[PDB]
Each structure stands twice: as C-alpha cells, then as structure tokens.
C-alpha cells in the first residue's frame, strides 16, 4: 500500500496485582498518532502527533468512548480465553489484536486486515477478501462459527473499505507536512580498525522517513550477504529512522567494497565508498 | 478513527453496555 492506518491493541493479565492492563496505539504509516493506556490517569484517547491535535472535542469524546469500550472487551477476553484453554487464574496471559486499511497511490481502498492472537499465537484472522475467516484451532473455530452467524465480516468489511479509508484520507490531507513527506537518508561511512590486518567499514543511513530502506554491501560488485552485519531499522526518537550495515575487510582492500542505499527519497540508489 | 466493538467482532460472551 501507499498509505495505511493501523491500530494495535494489547491486553495483559496480572493476577497478583489487580485488573488487566490494556494499551491501544494508532498509526498512519510509520507515524504514531494516538494512544490509550488503561493504567494512565487521563482515561482518554490522547494525541501523539501534532496534526491530530487539530481535531475537535467531538472527535476526542468519540475516540475516548470507543477506546474505553475496546479496553473493557480485551481485558475481559483474557478471562474468556483462559477458560477456553483450561488455564489457571494464576498465570499472566496476553491478548493482541491488529487491524487496518491500506490505500493505493490514488488514496482509494487497496486492502483491509484484521488479526487476533492469544499468548502470541494466531487465534483468528479475517481473510484478504474481507468476507471469510481463518481459525487456528478448536477454540478459534467456535469464535469463527459465532462471527459467521452474526455476519461480523459484513460490519468489519464496511469499516475497513469505508470509514477506515475515509479517515485515513482525512489524516493524510490534514497532516500532509508530516505524513506525505519523504526524508531521504543522510548517509556516511565510518572506518574502525579491528587490528593491523582488518578494519570494519560501517555504512550509515540516518534521519530517514518512511522506515523502509535497503542497505547492501558488495566486494567487486558482488553482494556480501553472509558477511554483512545488518542491524534492524530503529527509531531515532524524532519521527525518523536509522540503520547501518558493516563488513570486516582486509587492510588495504577497502577500495573493492561499496555500500548501496535504496530509499524512497533517493531518486537513484546511492553508492558509498570509504574515503580516506 | 476507531471502529466500534460490533464492527471488530466480540469474541466473548455479551456484557452490559
């Protein structure tokens, strides 16, 4: 998809110390825009991006009302699922639910998705046609039958194809400065001698947005798949991302090595070399 | 913009609204 709106729900039981905790986070692409924490003092859906702050009190009262109802649902589901799996009231368990919609380059509906997990395992998922379900086991099959009889997929599909993409289009326009931006990576290479025989060459990509990026190392233009240390893309904390890739090279052979950076903000893939 | 609980599907037993 070109753009996406996604919500992530987590409910965790803590039998020893009170009621379950529920966390909800909303994203547009790689940018978080809303949060709700059942443990927090506000008891309100809270803004986490400046462009969503423009929304009026009716929006915030509506999101607060809905998120409090989802909080209740997912905290209670823990007890329901514990019973479905014959589990004791002693242990801590997890409920996770993710869903959202993607739009194409034209900002028109492309896909919808919805998945539910219990204790980090798939439980039930909406299929890509937004009309049928996939149940993981015996217990999930009974949820599936219940949702089939109640025509849940019809309501979910109407939300994913309608409401979800209409509000995504609204956010993309209102938050265009933040959301429609491309921050090409700021790239550099560092050299760190390991010994008198070898040196580490580290190819950096900083301050980029969106998170999607490809860093590859080559020796004489041959991909160094096996010998590259590639770190997971990580958040900088300011709404941008970071990534690096490193290779250990024989001292004096640095010139044979090249790093290539591919990113949306780069008109062409970029070649980096060690410049002594 | 969030879906309502009935749009997502209620896994468990009915609870007072």
């Amino acid at each position: 998809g070109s753009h996406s709106m996604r919500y992530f729900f987590t409910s965790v039981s803590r039998p020893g110390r009170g009621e379950p905790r529920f966390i909800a986070v909303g994203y547009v692409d790689d940018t978080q825009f809303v949060r709700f924490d059942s443990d927090a003092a506000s008891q309100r859906m809270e803004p986490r991006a400046p462009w969503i702050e423009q929304e009026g009190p009716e929006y915030w009262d509506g999101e607060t009302r809905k998120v409090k109802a989802h909080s209740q649902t997912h905290r209670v589901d823990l007890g329901t699922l514990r019973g479905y799996y014959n589990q004791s009231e002693a242990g801590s368990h997890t409920v996770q639910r993710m869903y959202g919609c993607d739009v194409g380059s034209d900002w028109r509906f492309l896909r919808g998705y919805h998945q539910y997990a219990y204790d980090g395992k798939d439980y039930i998922a909406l299929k890509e046609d937004l009309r049928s379900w996939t149940a993981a086991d015996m217990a999930a099959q009974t949820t599936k039958h219940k949702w089939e009889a109640a025509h849940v997929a019809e309501q979910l599909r109407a939300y994913l194809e309608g409401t979800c993409v209409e509000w995504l289009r609204r956010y993309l326009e209102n938050g265009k400065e933040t959301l429609q931006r491309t921050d090409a990576p700021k790239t550099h290479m560092t050299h760190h001698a390991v010994s008198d025989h070898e040196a580490t060459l580290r190819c950096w990509a900083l301050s980029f947005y969106p998170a999607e990026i490809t860093l590859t190392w080559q020796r004489d233009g041959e991909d160094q798949t096996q010998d590259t240390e590639l770190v997971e893309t990580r958040p900088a904390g300011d709404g941008t991302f970071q990534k690096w890739a490193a290779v250990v090279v024989p001292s004096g052979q640095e010139q044979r090595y090249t790093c290539h950076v591919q990113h949306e903000g780069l008109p062409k893939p970029l070649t980096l070399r060690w410049e002594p | 913009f969030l879906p309502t609980p009935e749009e997502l599907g209620l896994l468990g037993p009915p609870r007072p609204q």
């Binding site: 997890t94 996770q96 997990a117 560092t190 770190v231 900088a236 904390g237 | -």
Partner: protein, 99 residues
C-alpha cells in the same frame, strides 16, 4: 510462547562530546510484554527515562523505545540494562558511539 528481546543502544544524532543529544535503547522481538529496561550512566540507573507506547510487529513480538536526553563525554559510560523472563540474568549492552 517465549521470545528473547533484541537490544540496540544508540544516540539520536552522531555523538559529539559536550553536545546535548538523546540516548536510546530499542528493545524488540520479545514475548511476553513484561520487560525491565534501564538506561545507565556509569552503571547507575538514570531516572525519568521516557518510553514509547507498547506496540508489536507482524509476528506479534513487542517493541519499545526507552530514551533520555544526555550529553556524552569522553569518560562517561552509557548502557542499557534489560531483564526479561527469557534471560537467566539481566543483559547489559554498552553504548558505543560507533554503533
């Protein structure tokens, strides 16, 4: 059922001694969600460290960003200490400005 956290300790901007920056500890790929994360200055817990709202990846594994403002120097040591049910002992990852 159980997934061990991946840990990355780094700064928001390339470090320059005496210049204000942000110290980050990114924990990801873990399950269950309960985790203990501390940013350390000379082996001591930094207070008022902030963290991101709990979220998760396609495979259901959780991720969190812990961060605080810092001013790196030549001699001060920074680190991130993580404890999770999958670890027999807390894991300390030292901050290296080159990573």
């Amino acid at each position: 059922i159980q997934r061990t956290p991946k840990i990355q300790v780094y700064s928001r901007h390339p470090a320059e001694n005496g210049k204000s920056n942000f110290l980050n500890c990114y924990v990801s790929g873990f399950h269950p969600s309960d985790i203990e994360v501390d940013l350390l200055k000379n082996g001591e817990r930094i207070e008022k460290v902030e963290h991101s709202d709990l979220s998760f990846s396609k495979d259901w594994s959780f991720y969190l960003l812990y961060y605080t403002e810092f001013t790196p120097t030549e001699k001060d040591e920074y680190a991130c200490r993580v404890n999770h049910v999958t670890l027999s002992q807390p894991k300390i990852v030292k901050w290296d400005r080159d990573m």
